[PDB]
Symmetry: D2
Subunit: 246 residues, 4 copies
C-alpha cells in the first residue's frame, strides 16, 4: 500500500521537516542519523504515534571510508526490511565548515566530499540496484558564488549537481527520476547572530531565511505525481538570494 522514503540526516532541521512532511503525505520513513540518536528516536516516536509502524531509525556515519559502501547499502536495505519497498531517496545529510587553501585534510575530504557527494552516489547506486520512483538531492543555491574559504564543501556540492544530472540521465530508463532542491539561507547552522541578520537582510524576498518547511515543500513537489516528467532539475528555494550581486 503506502510508499516508503529514506531521508538521510533526518533527525533535525531540514531533514526533519522533510521527513515530517513526507510522513504527512502518507510515506513510511527511514530516519537516518549519525550523532543525533535521541532526536531521531523522538521524531520516530512522534510519527509512529500518528500512524503505527510507519517510521524506523537507522544509524550510520556517512563519512567516506572503505565501509561507506556497506553503510549506504544497509540504509537502502533497512527501508526494504521495514516496509517492503523504497520509493524515495532524499540525500539530505551534509557536513559544512571552512577549509582554507592558505582534522587532517584527508578527514575534511572524507566528510565534505564523502557525505555531500560520495554517500549520495552510493545510496543512489544501491537504491537503483534494488529496483513513482525518484531521488531528491539537497544542493546549494550559492554554488556559483561560494562562501570564501569553503572550497571542499563547494566541490562536494558541485559534485552533487554532477551526480544529479548523471543519475537523472542513466536512471531515466528505469523510471527513476533524479532532482534537487537548492536552499539559499535556511535556518542558520550555533552560527553567528549579527552574522545571521546580515544574511536575512540580503534576501530579496522578505529579508528572511527560508523555513525548513519551505525546503520540504519543494521536495514534496518533486516526489509527487505533479513532477512526473521532471528529472535533472534543481529547484532553487532561496528567495532570490542567488540573483543579488556583490
Amino acid at each position: 500500500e503506502a510508499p516508503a522514503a529514506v531521508v538521510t540526516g533526518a533527525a533535525k532541521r531540514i531533514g526533519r521537516a522533510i521527513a515530517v512532511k513526507l510522513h504527512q503525505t502518507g510515506y513510511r520513513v527511514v530516519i537516518h542519523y549519525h550523532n543525533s540518536a535521541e532526536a531521531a528516536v523522538s521524531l520516530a516516536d512522534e510519527l509512529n504515534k500518528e500512524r503505527s509502524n510507519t517510521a524506523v531509525v537507522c544509524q550510520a556515519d556517512l563519512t567516506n571510508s572503505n565501509v561507506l559502501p556497506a553503510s549506504c547499502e544497509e540504509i537502502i536495505n533497512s527501508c526494504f526490511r521495514a516496509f517492503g519497498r523504497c520509493d524515495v531517496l532524499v540525500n539530505n545529510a551534509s557536513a559544512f565548515y571552512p577549509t582554507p587553501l592558505v582534522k587532517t585534510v584527508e578527514t575534511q575530504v572524507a566528510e565534505l566530499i564523502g557525505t555531500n557527494a560520495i554517500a549520495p552516489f552510493l545510496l543512489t547506486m544501491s537504491f537503483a540496484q534494488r529496483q513513482n520512483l525518484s531521488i531528491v538531492n539537497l544542493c546549494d543555491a550559492m554554488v556559483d558564488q561560494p562562501c570564501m574559504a569553503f572550497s571542499l564543501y563547494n566541490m562536494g556540492k558541485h559534485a552533487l549537481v554532477g551526480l544529479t544530472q548523471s543519475a537523472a540521465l542513466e536512471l531515466a530508463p528505469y523510471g527513476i527520476r533524479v532532482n534537487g532542491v537548492a536552499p539559499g539561507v535556511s535556518l542558520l547552522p550555533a552560527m553567528g547572530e549579527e552574522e545571521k541578520d546580515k544574511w536575512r537582510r540580503k534576501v530579496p524576498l522578505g529579508r528572511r531565511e527560508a523555513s525548513a518547511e519551505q525546503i520540504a515543500d519543494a521536495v514534496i513537489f518533486l516526489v509527487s505525481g505533479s513532477a512526473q516528467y521532471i528529472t535533472g532539475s534543481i529547484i532553487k528555494v532561496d528567495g532570490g538570494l542567488s540573483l543579488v550581486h556583490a
Copy 2:
C-alpha cells in the same frame, strides 16, 4: 473571494491546460488569445459552465510595435475589470519559426513577432501587472533547450534568452513588492501541428524519461506549483520540465 489569473495564448495547448488547471484550483481566468477566437470562446464557456462568472476572453496581438504597451496594459486591465483583481500572470504566448542567418515576412516583422511575444510583451505585461498592484506571482514559459538551440532559430532563441533575463531581473526588482517571478521550461511538449510524424518520433526517441514529450498537463502542473503557497520562498527559479532531454549530448 477567488484569486484571478491572466494566461496569454491560453486558447490552445499548454496555455489552455494552464488555464484549466488554474481554474480547477479556484482561480478566475482571463483567457488571452490572438487568432484562436473559437477555441478561446469555447474554453471560457466550459469554465463558466462549471463556475459562472469565472472566465473571460481578451483578444490581442503580442507582436512588438508602438501600441504593444497599450495592448499589454489592456490585457491586465481586463482582469481587473472582470474580477476586481489580478494575482497571477502567466506569460505563455509565443511565436516559433526559423530565421536562418544565411538565406515571406520581412526581418523587421520576424524581430517584432519572435522578440515581441517571447520577451517584450512579457516585460510590458509584467510592468502593467506590477503597476496595477495575497500570493502574487508571475510564471514565464521559457525553453529547456536555450543553450542547445534548434539550428536556424536565432531570433526565437534570443527571445527565450531575454525571457530568462526578465525572469531574474523582475524577480529581483519585484520581490520587495511581494511578487515572485519564476519560470517553467518545457523540452518537447505537444509538438507543432504543422510538423510531420517521423520528425515527432525522432524527437520522442531523444527523451530519456519515457521516450515521449510532455503532456500539456505536466507543464501546467509546474505552473500550479510555482503559483501555489508551497512556492512562497521561490523566486527567480526556472523549473525544467523536459524528461532529461537537455542532459543528452549530441
Copy 3:
C-alpha cells in the same frame, strides 16, 4: 594582404581599445560610431598616420527601427568597399541605463536597449555571413545572472546576445565562421564619483580595480587569433572574479 575588422561603437573606451589592438595586429578597421564623430575621426587619423589607408569611419544609429537592417547591411558593406574583405565583426556598441518596472517612451527604451545590445548584433551577423579565419566577437556582460536592479531591458538585451552568440556559433560553424563573446565585469566606469567607483573596485577580488579597456581588448584579440581556431560558442569573462562574489 591585411585582414579587415568592423568594430561597432569604436570611437571611445572599450571599442576604441579593441579597434587600436586589432589595428596593431595588422587589421584594417571600420570604426563605427553614432554620436562621437570627432573621436571616431581622430582615431581613424591616428591609425592612418601609423599605416596609410587602414582605417575608415562609419556613422549609424543602431537603435531598432525599420531602417536598422539597411543600416547594418551598409556597415558590413562599407568594410568590403574600403578594404575588399571583412574577416572580423566586433559587436561592441551598447546602450545602458535603467528601465524600472514600477524621459523616453518605453518603446524607445526597447528600441535602444534591445536594438543595440541584441537586434543590431543579429542583423550585423546576418550581413557579415551573407557576404562570405572569420570570426565574430560579441561584448556580453559577466553580471547577466546577478543583474543591476531596475535594468530589466538592458539585462534582457544582454541575455539575448548570449543566445545569439550560441545560435550563430552553431549555425555559422559549417561556413567556418566562429562566434564568441567577451564578458566584462566592471571596466572603465560610467564621470561617476570616485567614491561610488571605489564601491565597485572594492568588490573585485583580483586587484580591487576595474578592467582597463585594453584588458577587455586582449581577450577579443585572443578570440580572433589563430590560437582560438577551435573555439566557438564561448564567452570569456574578463571580470577579475567579480561574478563569483556573493551578496
Copy 4:
C-alpha cells in the same frame, strides 16, 4: 629569470602539448607522470636538448589516499627544487572510465576518479599557494559536464568538483595575486583504446569542422590564460570544443 610551471600527466597527449607550448614560451617545466615513465623522460630529453636544465620529470600517483597530500606537496617541491620558483600549475592528469550506477572496487574508483580529477587539484592548489610576477593555475575541465557520457557519474562528479574548485580557488587566491581559470575541451585526442569508427561518430557531431581538437589547440587556450594578456581573468573556464556543447540530442 625564466618562469617555471608544473604540468600534471604531462608525458603524453594534451599535458605533453601543454608542457611543450609552455616550454616554447620560455617556461621551465616539471613533467609530472604516473605510469608513462619512458614517454616522460623522452619528452624531458627533447626539451633539455632545446635548452639545458629546463625540464625535470616527477613520478606520482594522484589517486586519493592518506598520502596524497604529501605527494602533491612533493610535486610542488619538485619545481622549487629544480627551478627556484613555481609560477604556473596546470591540473591536467585525469582518470576517465565508466562507473555504471546499475576489476576495481567502488572505493578504488572513487579514489582514482575523484582523486585525480578533483582532490589532487585541490591539494596541489593548496601547496602551490602555500609556497608563494604572473602566478596562475589552469584546470583542465570538460565542456560536456552538463551533457555527460552515460554511466560516467564518478568522472562527471570529479569534473564538476573541479569547476567548483576553479571558482572557489579563484575567489580565495585573488587577494594573493594567484589567478585560477580552466580550459574545457569537448573532444580532443580520443582515447588510444577507441576504435576508428567510434572516433568518427564523435567527429561528426562537432559543428566546427567535424573533427576533434588537436592537443595543440587545447594548449593554446592554456597558454593564453597564463599569459599577460589574461591578467584580469580569474574564475573563467574557456570551452575549446568547436561548438560541440551547443548541439542538441
